[PDB]
Amino acid sequence: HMEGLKQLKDLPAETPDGKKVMLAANIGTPKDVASALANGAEGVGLFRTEFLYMDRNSLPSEEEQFEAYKEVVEKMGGRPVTIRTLDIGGDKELPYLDMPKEMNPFLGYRAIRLCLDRPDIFKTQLRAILRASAYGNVQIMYPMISSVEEVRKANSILEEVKAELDREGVKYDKEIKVGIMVEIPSAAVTADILAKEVDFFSIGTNDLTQYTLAVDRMNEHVKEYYQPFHPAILRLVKMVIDAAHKEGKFAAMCGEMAGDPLAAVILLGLGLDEFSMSATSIPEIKNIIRNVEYEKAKEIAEKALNMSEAREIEKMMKDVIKDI
């Protein structure tokens, strides 16, 4: 039941036996929206906001951020747009920040840790996001979360800015959903604790794999140690999905794995709610979903979770994709 792109665009990612999932786009600039919609994106599962901070000599103003966020939210016309707060560290050059030199920047002062130490930066971004939420379906997502304590600290600043907007008579979505990236292993291991205090999870498998295997995903000398289908990763993914569902929340994935045809059936079978990916990956994943029964996918996921080697998992999924 494979379909062509033109036919697929308006079709749902639904199994022949009625299991529906959401396919969304990852974007890094408002310019990416056109392609996302052209590929049938049902939302933006990850709006990377670093573009507003790069290649400039001062912080992006609240207004500039707001205009950027609003544009995307408007164009998505009601579809949910999940905006990830600043996720940057000392490995990038930002003339206006003054970041410490670090031996291991990926394990250092970055992302939510930077924002909590620089609430001036954080409040500005949160204000712009909140203001944009008046014009569509907006969700907030915190990156590099290691603990529920950090979520509470971040939410405290969020509530602070909400109160500011209230006093200023500025509109925002009072029901705005707030979730976290799951990419630090501790967040996956304690997803049950976090699930009680976040509206949703989005699994960042790029860095989850990096941290869980202790392998820099950019380091050529150990590239063979970077293994997304390592059983540990599948187990952590399952843990996050189950944890969200136990509390009646949703689990998304915006790591590259979500756009991987080899992973599609496993993710479907594990009960992943939302796949977020490069726009042009959407039709391919949709075709797979539409051509595999949910019950079959669950059997396949179960089989994958019982294997011991990434290699045999990949071999199995190669065959599955072959059969359709």
96 touches, from Mg ion, a second copy, none (C-beta below 5 to 8 Å by class): none
Query: Do the annotations mark residue 152 as ligand-binding?
Result: no
Burial class (CB in 10 A: 0-12, 13-18, 19+), 51: middle
Please, are residues 121 and 85 in contact by the beta-carbon 8 Å criterion?
A: no
- Binding to a second copy (CB under 8 A): which residues in 197-236? 210-216, 218-219, 221-222, 225, 227, 230-233, 235-236
Query: Do the annotations mark residue 48 as ligand-binding?
Result: yes
Applying CB under 8 A, the span of 15-23, 50-58, 139-147, 259-267 interacting with a second copy comes to 139-147
Residue 214's SS3 state is coil
Backbone angles phi, psi at 23, to 5 degrees: -110, 120
Position 134 contacts a second copy (CB under 8 A):
no
Query: Do the annotations mark residue 120 as ligand-binding?
Result: no
Return the DSSP state at 106: G
Residue 183 or 256: which CB sits closer to Mg ion?
A: 183
- Binding to a second copy (CB under 8 A): which residues in 28-87? none
204 touches, from a second copy, Mg ion, none (C-beta below 5 to 8 Å by class): Mg ion
SS3 string, 72-98, reads HHHHCCCCCEEEECCCCCCCCCCCCCC
Q: How far apart are the first and last CA of the chain?
A: 9
Q: Are strands 81-84 and 44-48 parallel, antiparallel or unpaired?
A: parallel
Residue 138 or 145: which CB sits closer to a second copy?
A: 145
Please, are residues 37 and 75 in contact by the beta-carbon 8 Å criterion?
A: yes
Which one, of 158, 134, 308, 316, lies nearest residue 235 by Cα? 308
Q: For a second copy, which residue of 179, 185, 228, 269 counts as binding (CB under 8 A)?
A: 185
Backbone angles phi, psi at 106, to 5 degrees: -65, -15
DSSP string computed for 222-241: GGGG--TT-HHHHHHHHHHH
Q: CA-CA distance, 285 to 34, in Å (whole number)?
A: 19
Q: For Mg ion, which residue of 43, 204, 259, 283 counts as binding (CB under 5 A)?
A: 204
Position 113 contacts a second copy (CB under 8 A):
yes
Please, are residues 289 and 268 in contact by the beta-carbon 8 Å criterion?
A: yes
Q: Active-site residues: which are they?
A: 254
222 touches, from a second copy, Mg ion, none (C-beta below 5 to 8 Å by class): a second copy
Q: For Mg ion, which residue of 207, 256, 260, 273 counts as binding (CB under 5 A)?
A: 207
Q: CA-CA distance, 225 to 200, in Å (whole number)?
A: 30
Which one, of 80, 143, 76, lies nearest residue 116 by Cα? 143
Residue 55 or 149: which CB sits closer to a second copy?
A: 149
- Binding to a second copy (CB under 8 A): which residues in 281-320? 308-311
Q: For a second copy, which residue of 4, 95, 100, 169 counts as binding (CB under 8 A)?
A: 100
Position 256 contacts Mg ion (CB under 5 A):
no
Q: CA-CA distance, 262 to 268, in Å (whole number)?
A: 11
Residue 35 or 146: which CB sits closer to a second copy?
A: 146
Binding site for Mg ion (CB under 5 A): 183, 204, 207
Residues within the annotated binding site for Mg(2+)? 87, 183, 207
Residues within the annotated binding site for phosphoenolpyruvate? 48, 84, 206-207, 217
Residues within the annotated binding site? 48, 84, 87, 183, 206-207, 217
Binding site for a second copy (CB under 8 A): 91, 100, 102-109, 113, 144, 146-149, 184-186, 189-190, 193, 210-216, 218-219, 221-222, 225, 227, 230-233, 235-236, 308-311
